[PDB]
């Protein structure tokens, strides 16, 4: 997260860390939607060109964390994966359309003050909140900037970062880049003349873009950090996977492999 701030304790209890077992390293973010289901981006699990073609056994997820590196005793929980599910139409060879995946935990995680699931949007919440100008929130342990000098500079955050960002009109998203944009994507960020700024960056993919419903006071995950051109660039915006538009796939995978 670029130009964001440290998150408050328990501010994003559905936050999940996707870890590679060997070598041990932080790969992406993800989000808790139940005691056994975790949502993330497809390219975090499968993108052969960038050394990514994982199986359930190559990964681990850490839940309830705040510090990026410090082991938080009796607070964070580690879960192994039973099965990984990637959207059937996701095709890394062509583009990042349908950038979504589900991970089933071997065993249910126990909830606490620091671990709690986020809600998925229904159609009315989606129609009501997915409007240009409306602000959402993005969180993650991704990089703080595009580049830095190793060891002397600092590009990795010490604790979970957060940033509130406004949804941008589709015509504006489309004219900001030559990359083909689909309806399964939406963009957000401040406009160059706004003065304010912020964006997600490398390592934040799979993380959630959430909004708080003024109707029932609940937090809903409207998007998944997917891609961008550089990080926090004037005239460029971050792109997110449109969760509601792919909710039917989520449903299908669940009452078909949930047990």
């Amino acid at each position: 997260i670029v130009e964001g701030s440290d998150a408050e304790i328990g501010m994003s209890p559905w936050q999940v860390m996707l870890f590679r077992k060997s070598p041990q390293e932080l790969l992406c973010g993800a989000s808790l939607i139940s005691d056994r289901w975790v949502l993330t981006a497809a390219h975090c699990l499968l993108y052969p060109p960038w050394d990514k073609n994982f199986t359930e056994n190559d990964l681990l997820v850490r839940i309830g964390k705040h510090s990026r590196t410090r082991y938080e005793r009796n607070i964070e929980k580690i879960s192994m994966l039973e099965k990984i599910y990637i959207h059937p139409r996701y095709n890394w060879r062509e583009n990042l359309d349908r950038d979504i995946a589900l991970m089933k935990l071997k065993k249910p995680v126990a909830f606490s003050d620091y671990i709690h699931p986020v809600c998925l949007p229904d159609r009315e919440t989606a129609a009501s909140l997915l409007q240009a100008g409306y602000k959402g929130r993005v969180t993650g342990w991704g990089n703080l900037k595009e580049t830095w000098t190793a060891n002397v500079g600092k590009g990795q955050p010490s604790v979970l970062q957060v940033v509130n960002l406004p949804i941008v009109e589709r015509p504006v998203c489309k004219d900001s880049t030559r990359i083909r944009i689909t309806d399964n994507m939406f963009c957000a960020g401040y406009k160059p003349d706004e003065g304010k700024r912020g964006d997600a960056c490398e390592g934040d993919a799979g993380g959630p873009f959430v909004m708080k419903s003024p109707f029932n006071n609940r937090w809903y995950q409207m998007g998944i950090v997917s891609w961008g051109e550089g990080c926090d660039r004037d005239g460029k915006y971050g792109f997110y996977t449109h969760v509601f538009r792919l909710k039917k796939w989520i449903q299908k995978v669940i009452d078909q492999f949930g047990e």
Partner: protein, 45 residues
């Protein structure tokens, strides 16, 4: 909090009923430092 159940706990697991309500904030009627920023942007017409 009128929330409409969408999943089947048999396959989804527990958690949907109380989703999106944070133990350290909504559950204790406390607001985090910047959520007002979000809520104030949801105007409409």
């Amino acid at each position: 909090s009128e929330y409409q159940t969408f999943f089947n706990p048999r396959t989804f697991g527990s958690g949907e009923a109380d989703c999106g309500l944070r133990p350290l904030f909504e559950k204790k009627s406390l607001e985090d430092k910047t959520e007002r920023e979000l809520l104030e942007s949801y105007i409409d017409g």
